[PDB]
Amino acid sequence: GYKIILIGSSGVGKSSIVHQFLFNRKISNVSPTIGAAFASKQVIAKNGKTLKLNIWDTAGQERFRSITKMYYTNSLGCLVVFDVTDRESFDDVYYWINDLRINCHTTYYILVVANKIDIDKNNWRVSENEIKKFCRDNDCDYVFASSFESDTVNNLFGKMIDKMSEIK
Numbered sequence: 820g821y822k823i824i825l826i827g828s829s830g831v832g833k834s835s836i837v838h839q840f841l842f843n844r845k846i847s848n849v850s851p852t853i854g855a856a857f858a859s860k861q862v863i864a865k866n867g868k869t870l871k872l873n874i875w876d877t878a879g880q881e882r883f884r885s886i887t888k889m890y891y892t893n894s895l896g897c898l899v900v901f902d903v904t905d906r907e908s909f910d911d912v913y914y915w916i917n918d919l920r921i922n923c924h925t926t927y928y929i930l931v932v933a934n935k936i937d938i939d940k941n942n943w944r945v946s947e948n949e950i951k952k953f954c955r956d957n958d959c960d961y962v963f964a965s966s967f968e969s970d971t972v973n974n975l976f977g978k979m980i981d982k983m984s985e986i987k
């Protein structure tokens with residue numbers, strides 16, 4: 820299968836994005852087990868390739884900046900999530916992408932997710948122009964999302980699935 824990992828600072832919505840993609844709702848009393856994938860999902864890409872996605876989510880250990888080698892290793896895709904209203908979580912994106920790249924050299928596609936767009940724009944602390952510039956300077960892609968807007972979650976996983984489907 821294809822290992823896809825979620826990274827990003829605490830509380831940005833990593834688990835909620837995963838639950839929306841897998842369950843169309845938040846399951847309130849389930850959390851990932853350390854050292855293993857949270858869930859796998861069979862998908863059919865636009866090109867008709869069938870892919871087994873193996874989705875890794877943290878169990879809260881990102882609060883300590885303590886993601887292990889084995890969490891990162893063998894990843895083919897990575898979603899780097901931040902919260903548009905949380906400036907520190909955006910500033911951390913640089914750290915997270917660097918940490919991924921020192922621990923894993925197999926990542927084919929890195930997608931920055933600017934999450935929580937459901938919140939009033941008066942509370943946003945980052946502009947699209949800054950996100951565009953950061954992703955240009957750091958060789959990654961970006962999308963806007965909200966875990967409460969199913970279309971945005973389908974869009975971000977769709978971009979990831981289509982990139983994974985191109986791997987030979």
Ligand SMILES: Nc1nc2c(ncn2[C@@H]2O[C@H](COP(=O)(O)OP(=O)(O)O)[C@@H](O)[C@H]2O)c(=O)[nH]1
Nearest residue numbers: 829830831832833834835934935937965966967
């Ligand atoms: N307003 C808003 N809240 C969100 C969104 N995604 C997640 N949350 C909330 O933010 C809190 C932390 O989310 P969680 O998924 O546990 O973040 P994680 O620490 O990155 O895994 C929870 O109360 C979520 O329901 C979003 O898109 N918009």
Ligand SMILES: [Mg+2]
Nearest residue numbers: 833834877879
């Ligand atoms: Mg979480």
